[PDB]
Every structure is written in C-alpha cells, then in structure tokens.
C-alpha cells in the first residue's frame, strides 16, 4: 500500500533504482504495478557564454528532474523488511507517504 515516488536528475540512476525497488517486494510479496513515469520536470537555465560584452552567443543548461512513481497493492509485513534492508542504492532521494 504505502506510497513512494522516485526523484532523480538522471533516469539511469532513477530507472535502475526504480527497477531496484521492485526487487524488494515484487520478488518478496504480491505483484506490483510497475513504475509510473511522471512527466519529467526541468529547470531550464540559459546563460550568456561570454563574461562581458558579447551578450549573444549564449549557451543553455538544464537541471532535469526525472520523477517516477511506484505503488504497491498489498503491503506485506515481510516485504517491508526487504525495503529498508536495501541500504545500497545511489545518489537519489525518495519519500514514503500515507
């Protein structure tokens, strides 16, 4: 039941993690509807290349934020053990909501 999203600026670190979470329950308890890809959120920053007069010639950067979601349909008292056990993830943050 309990709710978690997955937020990472890189899908590779996020999808894998999203694929990683599924292991700690879908192969520990009942089936889980796979990850739910939210529309990716961006933080679109374009900056003038030059340090002085050349106002044009700018260059663009993005701090993309890839959001994905996973919902378990039967919170199993043993699978949740397998969750916190996975203390080897990556540089990605996640939250748990009820």
């Amino acid at each position: 039941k309990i709710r978690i999203k997955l937020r990472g600026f890189d899908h590779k670190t996020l999808d894998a993690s999203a694929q990683k979470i599924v292991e700690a329950a879908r192969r520990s308890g009942a089936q889980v509807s796979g990850p739910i890809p939210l529309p990716t959120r961006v933080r679109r920053f374009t900056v003038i290349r030059g340090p002085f007069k050349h106002k044009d010639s700018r260059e663009h950067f993005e701090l993309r934020t890839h959001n994905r979601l996973v919902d378990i349909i039967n919170p199993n008292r043993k699978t949740i053990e397998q969750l916190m056990t996975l203390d080897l993830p990556t540089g990605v943050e996640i939250e748990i909501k009820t």
Binding site: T46, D56, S57, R58, H60
Partner: protein
C-alpha cells in the same frame, strides 16, 4: 462494433472514433456542425468521405485534446482514414496516391538565442 482513429498535427490531439451509423458527428458534445460555426476549412475536415463517395454512411464520435484549432481540424482529416483500414483496408489506393494518409508534420521552430521570432535576427547597423 466501431473503429478508432488517431490524429495529431501541430501537436494537437483529436481522438477519432468511427461507427457505422447514419448522421451523428459531434465533438465532446457541442456539435461539429455548430462547434465549428463560421469556418472555411470546415468542409475540409471531412474530405475522405466525398472522395470515397461515402459521407452519408458511417458515424463518428470525436474527442479533441488541446492543440491548435486548424491543427484540431487538420488532424481530424487523418483519424478518419487513420481508422477504418483495420477491417476496411481496401480504402487505400484511392487515398494514398491522391495523398491524404500522411501527417504533414510541420512543427514550429523554437525560439533561439541571439534572435527574435526563432529566425528573425535583429536589425543590423554597420554604423
């Protein structure tokens, strides 16, 4: 009991749904006859019927989703033909050669830095 069509042009979305009816063609309710009251391309949205001599025949549920008005029409001029072919597939050689079964994608150009409307560079002053 029906056939579905997809129609996307100019990032517009217009779900197309053909049924074998008689004369009901509306859009999200409203009424295609009068949703689009006051147009010019209005007849052009239903073309793959008189070109197949079959307007007084089938019926169509219509759902649009956002997109540009002409892009909402020009996409309908697809999902019609982008349907039917499932169980009505012989509807081809009097269409593709004449030239309907294509998206005619013409997506806009993005604005770019150091310019204005994407391609109009500012005034140029050698002086």
């Amino acid at each position: 009991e029906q056939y579905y069509g997809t129609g996307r042009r100019k990032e517009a979305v217009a779900r197309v749904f053909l049924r074998p009816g008689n004369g009901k063609v509306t859009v999200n309710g409203q009424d295609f006859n009068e949703y689009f009251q006051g147009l010019v391309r209005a007849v052009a949205a239903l073309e793959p019927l008189r070109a197949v001599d079959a307007l007084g025949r089938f019926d169509a549920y219509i759902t649009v989703r956002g997109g540009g008005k002409s892009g909402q029409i020009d996409a309908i001029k697809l999902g019609i033909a982008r349907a039917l072919v499932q169980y009505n597939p012989d509807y081809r050689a009097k269409l593709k050669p004449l030239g309907f079964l294509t998206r005619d994608a013409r997506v806009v150009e993005r604005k770019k830095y150091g310019k204005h409307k994407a391609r109009r560079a500012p005034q140029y002053s050698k002086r």
